[PDB]
Amino acid sequence: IVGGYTCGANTVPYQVSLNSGYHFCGGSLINSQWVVSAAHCYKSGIQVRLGEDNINVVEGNEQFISASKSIVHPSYNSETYNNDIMLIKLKSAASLNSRVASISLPTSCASAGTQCLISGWGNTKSSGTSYPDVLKCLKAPILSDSSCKSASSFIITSNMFCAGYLEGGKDACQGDSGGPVVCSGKLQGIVSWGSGCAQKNKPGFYTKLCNYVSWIKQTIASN
Ligand SMILES: [Ca+2]
16 A cells, blocks of 8 residues: 555454465455455465454464465456456354454445545555555545546456546555455455556556445355
8 A cells, every 4th residue: 555554453354464475465354254355366375364463473363264265256357357356265264353353245336436445565655665564554535437447548347446546646556456445334345456556647446346246145155
């Protein structure tokens, strides 16, 4: 997260880190046994780390649970990032408390102008690389589709929205992928991609979760 702020320990209790011997992506806890992340974050042997603040220090609110299933959307396109969504089943249920909690799925889509919270342990620099110890947060509005369509040579699919700041300096970045975009207490987005990070006229692009709710419920119910 570039241009964000330190969230505070466990203030985003649905935020998880996906770990393969190092943090590589975020995700969102949606019930005691299931995490939503990005399809482009898929790999074998993921360990889900819940209750994290400082990802480099054992502080005492962590639960580390192996993924038992990592399910990429069947229509994920790795070139366009269309349908950039993955469901992870935990090998055992997480123990839910104030610091480890699920986030609600949306009942409807959010409108342009809605303010959202984006979070993660991704790169905090727009030029070069710096990875934080603690969770970073960014308040960002959903933009109109014409501001994303004009804002990229790749035209935005109906399964994506963009959010953030056309002036530059405030955005998600590498290592934030798969993490949450929460608006009005509902999980509306998944950190998907962008052109660089926090560049002028190049907002962040997010998987539009409201389109996937029935798919998520069905996939969970069958697995
Ligand atoms: Ca920790």
